[PDB]
Amino acid sequence: IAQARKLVEQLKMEANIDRIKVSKAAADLMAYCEAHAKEDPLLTPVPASENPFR
Amino acid sequence: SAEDKAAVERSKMIDRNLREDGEKAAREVKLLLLGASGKCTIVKQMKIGIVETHFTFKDLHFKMFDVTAQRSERKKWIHCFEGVTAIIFCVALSDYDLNRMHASMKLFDSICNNKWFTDTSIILFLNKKDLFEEKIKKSPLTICYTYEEAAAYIQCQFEDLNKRKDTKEIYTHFTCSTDTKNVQFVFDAVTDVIIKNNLKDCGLF
Amino acid sequence: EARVTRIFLVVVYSIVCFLGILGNGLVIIIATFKMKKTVNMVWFLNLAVADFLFNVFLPIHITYAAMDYHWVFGTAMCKISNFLLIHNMFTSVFLLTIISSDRCISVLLPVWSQNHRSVRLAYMACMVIWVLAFFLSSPSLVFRDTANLHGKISCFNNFSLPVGYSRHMVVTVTRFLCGFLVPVLIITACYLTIVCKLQRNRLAKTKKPFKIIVTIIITFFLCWCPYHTLNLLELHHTAMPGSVFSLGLPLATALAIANSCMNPILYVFMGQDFKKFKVAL
Amino acid sequence: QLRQEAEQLKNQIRDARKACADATLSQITNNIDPVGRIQMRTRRTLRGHLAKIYAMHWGTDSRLLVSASQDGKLIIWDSYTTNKVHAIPLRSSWVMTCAYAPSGNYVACGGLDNICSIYNLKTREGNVRVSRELAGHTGYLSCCRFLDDNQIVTSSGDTTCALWDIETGQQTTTFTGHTGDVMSLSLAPDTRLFVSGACDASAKLWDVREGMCRQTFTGHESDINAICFFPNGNAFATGSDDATCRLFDLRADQELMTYSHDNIICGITSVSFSKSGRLLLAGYDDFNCNVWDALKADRAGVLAGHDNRVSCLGVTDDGMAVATGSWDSFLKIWN
Amino acid sequence: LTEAQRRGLQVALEEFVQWAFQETSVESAVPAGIFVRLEFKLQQTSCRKRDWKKPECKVGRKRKCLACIKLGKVLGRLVHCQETQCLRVQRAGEDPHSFYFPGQFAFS
């Protein structure tokens, strides 16, 4: 019964997490991607002059 | 080209060492021990994580990998044993009166039908023959499902679980008290497997 | 008609020539890059490169034959081209023999083959094979002299119009022996031993190795018997008539050069590497 | 009693999660510019392994990388010039994980021997020597990641994650909340939190210092194989054997978007993110890997250069290139 | 010999000027019954090609022509009045097997 009590306590502890709406998190990831979009060689191609793999 | 000369030379010597190590490793024959009897005390009692055992018979260096200590899911680490030359599966004839025999049959069927062992040979060891010799005299084989007929019937049922009869061959042996017959059987099986691999490499078939 | 046989035969000369050239190029390309490194890799690579050199030096003789045997390319060009052709063909024969012997040892002696097979040994065997072929092909570069004979200059073997001589008996005989007799005997013995081992304990299920062995032996004999026996028969050329030496000898050349193109079909293209390559394509 | 209360609390959690959702990532990112076709070529290949490659890890300087193979080799390559910087033999050839220290002074390995081996690279004599051996896990170590020169985090097949002090060699913290074999590990950029997915189709987030789980996600219907934190650190992507990969948010505590296609039936072995996280790299079992648009669930591209299944892949810290290893004994660098 | 060459010369003399020639004397002779390689000088006569049918005609060109003659063929017929043009046929031999150099019909 110890395992069941521990699982119940863990689930009760996890039930008390203050969450936020999906829209705000989506906006945060969108803003991060937009901000760091210009520093992604995979997304934006890099000229071969500065490319270490040439 | 002042600092790259030393870096390139290091790569060449490391590559040479890698080639030597690969050539040395390709000279070894590998066996994977399985069972439900899992420890395979019959083959681990010779005079010589997972357990690695080395032994030389007739100028052949056999490596044996025993995986009893791996009690987790089998499907998440069995794919690491693609390159094993053969699989030694141990099953006890004396466990028929203990479900245990059914578990052994299920394990053998799961191992033999695995996609990773399509062309991997399996050597089946029917251990504890001596105890089963008189254990049958007190309890019949009907509970699980002369010693000769019962042993042959168990062996043929174990061989029936195979589905890829054309891509692999199963070797069935009755474990004896002496250790001079199991070594010979294993050597013959691995010699046959080596012949198969050499013929496949040569491209004849 | 001017020459029906020559016109009919130069076509197949050219056809087998570029067929073998393309096959050797393909097998070299696949073996060098997209295949692992083993003893069989060394054997196949060296055989392929030898056959490729043979088939790239073949067109010179093909064009020489295409112009009614008129060696107009030079006065000493056949002193090297024929030597290189002989070296390549004898190297191919020696590697076929050593491949058959290696297969026989690997089948009959699994433990020894597992314990005593390394790339260094294969490289040493290849090097000594090339060295042995060089010594036997050395007389070729010293025994080509061009004669006119009222126009249509052609180069022959014997001498110019107590050294630098062979009596036509210590050269023709030895290339016959070491080029046909020992190789076919070794190959036949090895393959018959392999077949007996396979059939003794029913090792094989499909009849692929039997067909491969029988076709290898048949093609080797058919390709290397007529040319060698005609070269040996050249000693008593004053007794036999000139019709055979004028007709069968080009046919013997065609049969001999067919083997250099048929070897990749029988040896490498039946392996798993070619199956993987064709699956990827 | 206890079971009924647990079921009621789980139902309440599910209801709260459903009520907290007001929209989905698909509609919010409907008006964004599509990525298009991300076509990468193999700018560099490394061929020094004679067995299957099971693990790889990019260096902090994005110039040296490490690879683990079943032949018993841990090879450190110079990515720029294909130079083999180092080769470490392993006591056990069965290795399925490897880690590279952020300082670059140490390397890690582990496998079926349920022992984590830490080797010192920057030695006075220049020869790599074993610096630490950790043996406290019942099952095989599936993944290991470095935090610093002193602490490491490992996960094993006995449903247990551990935090090891390399100087002492003992288990400072233990996590035993998973009911299945943990298969992947990934740490937050600040090395304070880490998510781990197990074979019971659940991914749990753990605190390095506190030592207890806070959030658990059971979106997948199959055993999780790969996990990777988002570059932001408030989200992570999990790839499993159900031919689909999902993205979860710590703050949202639930699903955001899933990436799957009809033609994909094989499982997923490795998952990684780029610098901005706009596109995701997913290695599959169908002999090639895919690049997905993380914000639109669209296949941006396909990289197909491996003769066998892709086992591991990693993106450099500066995002200059990606490295993919496979069972065909070759590792390729795509850019 | 000379009779055969002269007989063959007259036949080819009708083709080769609207007039013909007739044999007057012999300058050179000779080598076997298959090829003679004879040469002689000719001169314009009174009778022409139409009258060349009968030798009995009324019979100043210093030609001194050379015309190799083959019997048995028509392979060799010198026309200039270079020497190399006859060496290709000035053999009178047999099957080329007689002039055999070991190695022509081979790559060895």
Numbering used by the authors:
A (entry chain C): 9 to 62
B (entry chain A): 6 to 41, 44 to 55, 183 to 232, 241 to 287, 295 to 354
C (entry chain R): 35 to 195, 211 to 330
D (entry chain B): 6 to 340
E (entry chain L): 22 to 37, 43 to 56, 61 to 89, 93 to 105, 109 to 117, 131 to 157
What does the study report here?
Chemerin functions as both an adipocytokine and a chemotactic factor and plays key roles in adipogenesis and inflammation. The chemerin receptors chemokine-like receptor 1 (CMKLR1) and G protein-coupled receptor 1 (GPR1), play crucial roles in regulating obesity, inflammation, and cancer, highlighting their potential as therapeutic targets. Although both receptors recognize the same ligand, chemerin, and share high sequence identity, they exhibit distinct signaling properties and biological functions. CMKLR1 is the canonical chemerin receptor that mediates both G protein and arrestin signaling, while GPR1 exhibits weak G protein signaling but strong arrestin-dependent and -independent internalization.
The wild-type CMKLR1 or the C-terminally truncated GPR1 was co-expressed with chemerin and Gi1 protein, then the complexes were purified and analyzed using cryo-electron microscopy (cryo-EM) single-particle analysis, yielding density maps at overall resolutions of 3.5 Å and 3.6 Å for the chemerin–CMKLR1–Gi1 and chemerin–GPR1–Gi1 complexes, respectively. In the chemerin–CMKLR1–Gi1 structure, the long axis of the chemerin core is perpendicular to the membrane plane, while in the chemerin–GPR1–Gi1 structure, the ligand core shifts towards the second extracellular loop (ECL2) with its long axis forming a 45° angle with the membrane plane. Although the cryo-EM map of the chemerin–CMKLR1–Gi1 complex does not allow modeling of the receptor N-terminus, our functional data imply the importance of this region in mediating the chemerin-induced CMKLR1 activation as well. It was observed that truncating over 20 residues in the receptor N-terminus led to an over 260-fold reduction of chemerin potency in triggering Gi activation. In the Gi1-bound CMKLR1 and GPR1 structures, the residue F156 of chemerin resides at the bottom of the ligand-binding pocket and forms hydrophobic contacts with the tyrosine residue at position 6.51 in both of the receptors (CMKLR1, Y2766.51; GPR1, Y2626.51; superscripts indicate Ballesteros-Weinstein nomenclature). Compared to the LRH7-C2-bound CMKLR1 structure, this interaction in the chemerin–CMKLR1–Gi1 and chemerin–GPR1–Gi1 complexes induces a rearrangement of the hydrophobic core formed by Y2766.51, H2776.52, and W2736.48 in the receptor, resulting in a shift of the “toggle switch” W2736.48 and triggering an outward movement of the receptor helix VI on the intracellular side. In addition to the rearrangement of the conserved “toggle switch” residue W2736.48 within the CW6.48xP motif, the residue F6.44 in P5.50I3.40F6.44 motif displays rotamer conformational change upon CMKLR1 activation, triggering the signaling cascade to induce the shift of helix VI and VII. The outward movement of the receptor helix VI in the Gi1-bound CMKLR1 and GPR1 generates a cavity on the receptor intracellular surface for G protein binding.
